């Protein structure tokens, strides 16, 4: 939601990191993307892809995930 | 009775057999029906034990081959001396050894390769050499190109003598097997004559030629102004000026008043402050003492006069409750098998080469070699590689003896038999220790890498964290530092300053300073132990299971060098003692590569450097090793990536050859993997297709093309692997050190 | 003289050596819980676990991630308990897989014998880890290794 | 962009290797010469020698000369 | 080769120094120096004695790929008979070790088959290849831009 | 095909398929593969001789 | 009980419990007559 | 176990029987070859798959073939 | 922005898919 505003400046985050082996330096080093917890920055381009498709809110992505779970079932 | 007996004109010198390749072998004399014959010719060229069953013939062939090798070595030495005389800047280096880079090779200006004639110095441009020949000659007392020309002449004459001796002792007077099987006489003569008289003659040369010439050179006298060695020999007054004890004569020697010679025979230790090398007056005493020791040792064995020992009696007498018969039969094994002797001698020669590398860097023996960093690194790594190869060859020839010349009838309940009978315990225990060392030596590096990458730098195995201090090595270093005056009372300085002491600096450059051991040193030493133990595991397992195993009860029948025993039993690939040598050679490459990398980084980071007017020394890398050598990332970045800059930025310079060889060695190393990862069937089928293409044009060789044998493919892969890896390290080391030194 | 065939059988894959067949070796092995005579498979496991958890507590306590913390000893004990549970699971799966349900009368090579052994090992291991935890928490020498 | 390009090129190479591997498996298992009496497939098998030899020649051609030019420049 | 070409050309264009590629792509030393050596700096500095950053994970995976690649070399160069004669001794040791012969394998421990070893070495080689280049590409691109 | 005659091999599994050899002997006893053919080219196994049937060999001109 | 606790609740499960149980059950299955 | 088979190209040289480290191949009577003998594989359960029989075979492609099949203790040559 | 109720609905759908996956795995194993 904060990437669709300034996509050329915001780094897209893939998912959060929860590793009980990280030290405080590692947590601080990985806390980026404007979030407040260690994260991975996506390199798959799914952000750009979905933005182009027409996804704007997190609710759109959540609805898509629900539909794909239903389709897998 | 030890006596001389020869056969006169056993073989007629004729070219008839030069035109009959494979004559030495019954299977090969027939002719090349396939291309495998070409490779077999070379593979079996020097396997005299497979040409004939005559131990006399094999021994004569070996003797003449040794003469040929000595002639080749003398030609090599004469070439080096002649190049020093004619294509070198040796005189300029003598005038100013700390400013002009030694060089004795010049390239021709053909395709722009004249760039390799770099500005070494002394108005001379050529290829910088890292063999230490200039320092050897300076220590010897050579001060002219005329003397080097005479040295080259002597080398050429000795090469001619050696080749003539080989021909004479094969074709004119070939000694018999009774002559060859004189171990007592052959050891007495070697020990006393060869070694003892060699070091005695060298002590005489050092006392009469090297010592005064080097004394004046260190005093600063010009090489042209220094008198000549024969002048020193005949003018006892001139030598009595430099070493005032020559006015006394040899009366002190013959009266045991040896203290009179303390001026030129002294137990001083340390390094010469001017040259940075060992005291030649210490080396003269060293060699004199060695001559006495060897001449005494060479009087131990019985030859013709009753006095002496018999090695058979000694061996048979040495046995205990855990070893049954003990050393019984070993004398016969060693005087009937050349391969056992070759294995022992190769193992000892390789270990000696390694020891020589270590001792020649911590106690630079030649003048101005310590501050010639390219020479030190090159010699250390070169001798390490020779040692590793010799050890692997010792394993190979132990396996060859086990397959060929081992007889259970003559080896019953002796040490060899008992080793074979409990080989399983040895290999299992060595396997466990190898796994334990691998874990607790490399998993430490992996742990450090993971902690540094997680930011838990306080959980690492470092001097600033959990510590692994080599307390035992530090204790030994302290002992050696304090020994002068305490446990070696009549020695003025420590044997090596590496143990501890003051920095020795020549030309505002460190020659040798204390080497401090910490956590990184502990880790790298235990990794050395791991690699050595794994190499030993491979080689010893192959040697012990050469004859038989639970998998292949009849392996000696297959031989020492066979591809496999088929895809049965699950697959019996690489089961022979040859394939053990193959894998152990891979692992020797690993071991020596780690050792030489350790040497390079440690010496560039904590020993070598330039000393400022403050008395402080700034090293080439500046303490990188202590905090970077504890992680594989540290080795990748601060050693390989950091130090490869010199070799990768060598284009357009006199090290452009090093850059090109870097790339070519990479190419060959990769090219080896084609042979190592592949098999013969694919290539034989590809050759079938290519032969169809050739036949479609109504032509094809009468010698049918065949893919390399399985063993030959493995050998080619290993040879290219070793050449590529060692050449990469060669270019990297030489470029880096010649750029920063 | 000192090395001979095993059990006077020259063709068995073993040798009679001082380490393998000495009087001290035989006495020690025969007196260890795994071999002592009379012990039920449960008592063997009890003794072995008592012995093993005790030394397990130490490495975790003095080299674990929370070793420089106030909770180092409790963390070490809880990691010891976790490893003990994992090893008890290993023992249980090994017992169910290797030994079939035939009854050889609790010889430690039976389903019932191995079940008793693993139960005793778990109990003894947890008990020994707890005992080591108590001793370390109450004795300064053990917390400082003599410093 | 670099990640996506590398990803899809590696996937492409894997898929091509798999396609050829399964062609070979078909030849081993499912090929019926009597059914494929002198059709394109049987002709491929007929002049496999020519195909393989010319492929080897073009490979050697390319390799020799590309590597030679690179080494000349070096 | 394909991805090296793509990545180097695009990196040079992105930084605007396409001349670097145009001039150094003609010899292999150019690739080794101005592409691999030059662009590996941020990746190998992901973590260092002086700290760490987010590229530490990619540096770790870089070394991980190197490790597994070299491990695959084991299976590809060393073949079965050696390991089968070694595992025989290991089985002997386990059977004759007291306090450990109480435990017994249910499947006879054997060395890997020939085809199995080829496959395992190939898998290790491929994983090292892919992970090493993934780390290099992503970390170098992220550290340069 | 007679003795000392050049015959081209027609056995597909043969190393000498569509190759010429010399007939060394023809056994009339009634064995499965009477003719014996000698070749100058050695096979992979190293044998330059083999036994063929009369339908797997054709005389050359 | 918020969603922020789910990572800490699950990662140990998916990474130690699920693998341990799967390995034990698979071991029992593969070694079974 | 491995499947060992013999074909009519057999000439009765017996080298396959003499080369077998186990005892899997034996000579039996035959009329299709001059020697009057043919190889047979009665004890195929003892075969290990070494293919020594295949190596010691002089006929254009082998009269004896070993097809490696299911593995047992004897086939794998496991002394433990 | 994604609520716990939304995550719980997603988890329920995931559980349904897991049950169906187990059913399919059994049917394929047969
Ligand atoms: C959708 C396409 C597809 C399909 C339907 C099949 C189907 C088949 N292939 Mg396959 N194949 C494919 C693509 C495909 N293939 C591709 C792209 C390739 C090229 C790589 C191959 C190459 C190939 C070969 C060479 C062979 C097959 C075989 C087979 C058959 C047996 C499968 C088998 O043994 O599973 C194998 C079961 C597994 C569980 C695979 C284990 C190994 C994989 C690669 C995992 C390794 C990665 C590792 C776990 C990751 C570690 C991560 C790290 C971070 C730690 C089967 C009919 C075999 C056959 O029967 O031939 C007659 C056979 O010999 N295939
Ligand atoms: C991906 C899953 C995963 C998870 C969730 C964890 C979690 C943990 N690891 Mg890590 N670890 C993993 C994978 C994982 N690891 C892998 C793959 C390896 C192999 C390289 C390691 C190797 C490793 C080491 C070498 C160490 C850790 C440690 C730790 C701990 C973090 C540091 C700390 O202060 O805790 C420590 C504080 C504690 C209070 C520990 C309490 C742990 C309880 C007792 C766990 C319960 C276990 C359970 C009952 C077992 C069920 C078995 C069943 C499945 C059969 C934590 C328990 C450190 C540690 O202390 O571990 C004990 C440690 O030293 N891990
Ligand atoms: C055995 C060791 C050895 C080695 C490796 C070399 C190597 C070399 N020598 Mg030689 N050289 C040797 C022994 C050796 N020499 C000896 C024993 C002598 C004394 C007779 C000489 C006398 C000698 C001379 C007089 C010259 C060389 C030159 C050379 C260089 C070019 C040779 C050439 O291109 O020939 C190619 C010839 C073919 C027939 C092919 C080359 C570095 C030349 C040099 O360095 O010029 C700058 C040169 O002029 N050498
Ligand atoms: C084989 C070696 C060797 C040889 C050929 C000579 C040869 C000579 N020595 Mg002797 N010398 C030697 C070893 C040798 N020395 C050693 C090892 C020592 C040390 C103990 C000496 C110590 C020595 C002294 C002190 C003197 C000689 C002298 C001489 C000369 C008269 C004898 C003669 C040139 C005399 C002379 O004139 O020297 C210049 C003399 O005074 N030598
Ligand atoms: C004192 C030293 C010594 C001696 C006298 C021998 C003697 C022998 N060895 Mg050798 N051996 C040695 C050291 C020695 N070895 C060492 C150090 C090793 C370890 C690598 C071995 C390992 C070894 C094995 C594993 C085997 C032998 C065998 C043999 C026998 C036959 C060798 C032959 O025909 O070579 C003829 C010469 C050649 C084939 C040439 C080989 C050279 C290769 C191709 C590399 C050369 C590269 C060169 C340096 C140039 C590189 C630069 C590039 C740019 C061109 C013979 C009894 C064989 C044997 O007994 O079999 C029954 C055998 O299998 N040896
Ligand atoms: C850098 C490593 C390397 C090199 C150079 C080659 C080279 C080759 N491979 Mg490849 N291969 C490699 C690694 C390598 N491979 C690996 C790791 C594997 C996996 C096992 C394979 C597996 C493999 C297979 C399965 C096949 C190939 C094939 C080929 C050929 C491809 C065509 C070609 O480029 O011809 C050009 C030739 C070259 C680039 C090599 C020439 C080298 C120099 C420059 C020539 C001059 C020599 C010089 C004068 C010698 C002086 C030294 C002397 C004094 C000692 C060629 C022989 C195919 C083939 O045979 O096609 C015909 C084939 O079927 N390779
Ligand atoms: C296949 C897609 C996928 C992948 C790769 C991941 C990956 C991850 N999820 Mg999961 N997740 C998924 C789908 C996926 N998720 C879906 C659809 C949901 C909504 C129900 C969730 C809900 C979810 C939560 C709430 C959390 C994670 C977390 C995580 C992380 C640790 C693993 C874990 O705790 O899983 C737990 C997963 C579940 C309890 C339910 C989802 C399980 C999926 C559907 C399994 C799919 C299997 C796949 C299709 C086939 C397997 C192939 C086989 C060869 C192994 C990790 C980054 C945890 C974390 O720490 O994140 C940072 C965390 O807190 N995920
Ligand atoms: C050298 C270290 C010697 C170890 C004691 C060994 C010792 O000195 O034994 C020496 C012992 C003496 O044997 P006898 O007196 O029967 O033989 C005297 C001989 O001179 C005649 O053969 O011989 C053995 O029992 C050999 C057993 C080797 C023992 C194998 C275990 C050691 C393997 C090497 C690993 C050592 C790591 C040690 C740390
Ligand atoms: C081989 C060698 C060479 C040089 C000399 C050296 C001595 C080092 C020697 C080696 C000696 C070695 C390795 C000694 C190691 C000793 C060890 C590990 C001893 C362990 C002792 C264990 C003890 C007390 C355990 C006590 C446990 C207790 C009450 C548990 C009680 C409980 C249980 C079991 C269950 C319910 C709860 C409750 C009541 C608390
Ligand atoms: C359309 C257009 C636009 C711009 C101008 C341009 C001139 C380019 C013009 C024309 C473009 C054209 C003609 C493009 C041509 C592309 C073609 C022909 C691509 C084909 C690639 C072929 C491939 C991979 C083949 C792979 C074959 C495989 C695995 C075979 C495997 C097999 C084997 C080994 C045994 C038998 C079974 C089976 C499965 C067949
Ligand atoms: C490439 C390759 C081949 C094919 C290679 C062959 C047949 C080598 C033939 C090369 C020619 C005849 C050598 C002459 C040309 C060289 C360029 C010159 C250098 C060699 C000399 C110094 C000896 C095999 O036969 C083979 C067999 C077993 C395992 C691996 C492999 C393998 O990898
Ligand atoms: S070797 Fe081939 S031909 Fe000779 S007997 Fe055995 S099978 Fe018959
Ligand atoms: S394979 Fe080995 S065992 Fe089986 S038949 Fe041929 S030779 Fe006898």
Short mmCIF file of C-alpha atoms in Angstrom, two decimals, chain B residues 126-266:
data_model
loop_
_atom_site.label_atom_id
_atom_site.label_comp_id
_atom_site.label_asym_id
_atom_site.label_seq_id
_atom_site.Cartn_x
_atom_site.Cartn_y
_atom_site.Cartn_z
CA UNK B 126 64.93 -9.00 -18.17
CA UNK B 127 62.74 -11.52 -16.38
CA UNK B 128 62.96 -11.37 -12.60
CA UNK B 129 64.04 -14.73 -11.17
CA UNK B 130 62.92 -16.17 -7.84
CA UNK B 131 65.21 -19.21 -7.50
CA UNK B 132 67.82 -17.67 -5.19
CA UNK B 133 70.78 -18.42 -7.47
CA UNK B 134 72.22 -14.93 -7.00
CA UNK B 135 72.26 -15.42 -3.23
CA UNK B 136 73.70 -18.93 -3.62
CA UNK B 137 76.57 -17.51 -5.67
CA UNK B 138 77.16 -14.61 -3.27
CA UNK B 139 77.38 -17.08 -0.39
CA UNK B 140 79.73 -19.24 -2.46
CA UNK B 141 81.94 -16.19 -2.99
CA UNK B 142 81.45 -15.73 -6.73
CA UNK B 143 82.09 -12.11 -7.76
CA UNK B 144 82.43 -12.30 -11.55
CA UNK B 145 80.80 -13.65 -14.68
CA UNK B 146 84.10 -15.42 -15.43
CA UNK B 147 83.65 -17.62 -12.36
CA UNK B 148 80.08 -18.36 -13.46
CA UNK B 149 81.33 -19.30 -16.92
CA UNK B 150 83.78 -21.71 -15.30
CA UNK B 151 80.93 -23.09 -13.17
CA UNK B 152 78.90 -23.68 -16.33
CA UNK B 153 81.89 -25.42 -17.92
CA UNK B 154 82.26 -27.68 -14.89
CA UNK B 155 78.55 -28.50 -15.00
CA UNK B 156 78.73 -29.36 -18.70
CA UNK B 157 81.79 -31.56 -18.15
CA UNK B 158 80.04 -33.37 -15.30
CA UNK B 159 76.94 -33.89 -17.45
CA UNK B 160 79.12 -35.45 -20.14
CA UNK B 161 80.84 -37.62 -17.54
CA UNK B 162 77.49 -38.79 -16.17
CA UNK B 163 76.04 -39.68 -19.57
CA UNK B 164 79.23 -41.53 -20.48
CA UNK B 165 79.09 -43.38 -17.16
CA UNK B 166 75.51 -44.45 -17.78
CA UNK B 167 76.35 -45.76 -21.24
CA UNK B 168 79.51 -47.45 -19.97
CA UNK B 169 77.79 -49.17 -17.05
CA UNK B 170 74.96 -50.46 -19.22
CA UNK B 171 76.81 -51.47 -22.40
CA UNK B 172 80.47 -51.96 -21.39
CA UNK B 173 80.78 -52.94 -17.70
CA UNK B 174 77.43 -53.73 -16.07
CA UNK B 175 77.71 -54.65 -12.37
CA UNK B 176 76.04 -57.82 -11.18
CA UNK B 177 73.27 -58.43 -8.67
CA UNK B 178 75.85 -59.38 -6.04
CA UNK B 179 77.43 -55.96 -6.51
CA UNK B 180 74.04 -54.25 -6.25
CA UNK B 181 72.96 -56.13 -3.11
CA UNK B 182 75.58 -54.56 -0.83
CA UNK B 183 73.47 -52.54 1.59
CA UNK B 184 76.16 -52.33 4.27
CA UNK B 185 78.89 -51.21 1.86
CA UNK B 186 76.45 -48.92 -0.08
CA UNK B 187 75.43 -47.14 3.17
CA UNK B 188 78.96 -46.96 4.59
CA UNK B 189 80.21 -45.33 1.40
CA UNK B 190 77.25 -42.98 0.98
CA UNK B 191 77.29 -41.81 4.61
CA UNK B 192 81.05 -41.43 4.99
CA UNK B 193 82.24 -40.64 1.48
CA UNK B 194 79.35 -38.92 -0.25
CA UNK B 195 77.77 -36.96 2.60
CA UNK B 196 80.66 -36.61 5.04
CA UNK B 197 83.29 -35.71 2.45
CA UNK B 198 80.82 -33.45 0.65
CA UNK B 199 80.15 -31.39 3.75
CA UNK B 200 83.85 -31.52 4.66
CA UNK B 201 84.80 -30.16 1.22
CA UNK B 202 82.08 -27.54 1.49
CA UNK B 203 83.38 -26.57 4.94
CA UNK B 204 86.84 -26.20 3.43
CA UNK B 205 85.46 -24.07 0.61
CA UNK B 206 83.55 -21.90 3.07
CA UNK B 207 86.59 -21.49 5.31
CA UNK B 208 88.98 -20.64 2.48
CA UNK B 209 86.77 -18.84 -0.08
CA UNK B 210 83.30 -17.92 1.13
CA UNK B 211 84.17 -16.60 4.59
CA UNK B 212 86.76 -13.91 3.70
CA UNK B 213 85.03 -12.82 0.49
CA UNK B 214 81.71 -12.41 2.29
CA UNK B 215 83.48 -10.72 5.21
CA UNK B 216 84.82 -8.07 2.84
CA UNK B 217 81.51 -7.80 0.98
CA UNK B 218 79.68 -7.14 4.25
CA UNK B 219 82.42 -4.67 5.21
CA UNK B 220 81.50 -2.89 1.97
CA UNK B 221 84.56 -3.64 -0.15
CA UNK B 222 83.85 -3.61 -3.86
CA UNK B 223 83.59 -7.03 -5.57
CA UNK B 224 86.28 -5.87 -8.02
CA UNK B 225 88.56 -4.83 -5.15
CA UNK B 226 88.14 -8.10 -3.22
CA UNK B 227 91.15 -10.42 -3.81
CA UNK B 228 90.79 -13.82 -5.46
CA UNK B 229 90.13 -17.15 -3.73
CA UNK B 230 93.53 -18.57 -4.66
CA UNK B 231 95.11 -15.41 -3.26
CA UNK B 232 93.32 -16.16 0.01
CA UNK B 233 94.44 -19.79 -0.16
CA UNK B 234 98.14 -19.02 -0.66
CA UNK B 235 98.45 -15.82 1.42
CA UNK B 236 97.95 -17.07 4.97
CA UNK B 237 98.77 -13.53 6.12
CA UNK B 238 95.91 -12.02 4.10
CA UNK B 239 93.50 -14.55 5.58
CA UNK B 240 95.13 -14.01 8.98
CA UNK B 241 94.05 -10.37 8.77
CA UNK B 242 90.36 -11.28 8.49
CA UNK B 243 90.50 -14.34 10.78
CA UNK B 244 93.57 -13.94 13.01
CA UNK B 245 93.65 -17.64 13.97
CA UNK B 246 95.10 -18.82 10.65
CA UNK B 247 98.48 -17.56 11.87
CA UNK B 248 98.27 -20.46 14.34
CA UNK B 249 98.01 -23.11 11.62
CA UNK B 250 96.71 -26.65 11.92
CA UNK B 251 98.63 -27.36 15.14
CA UNK B 252 95.53 -26.43 17.19
CA UNK B 253 93.48 -28.88 15.12
CA UNK B 254 95.91 -31.76 15.56
CA UNK B 255 96.45 -30.96 19.26
CA UNK B 256 92.71 -30.55 20.00
CA UNK B 257 93.19 -26.86 20.85
CA UNK B 258 90.07 -26.17 18.84
CA UNK B 259 89.16 -22.96 20.69
CA UNK B 260 91.86 -21.20 18.66
CA UNK B 261 89.48 -21.40 15.67
CA UNK B 262 86.60 -19.62 17.42
CA UNK B 263 87.06 -16.61 15.12
CA UNK B 264 85.86 -18.46 12.01
CA UNK B 265 84.27 -21.52 13.69
CA UNK B 266 81.71 -20.02 16.06
#
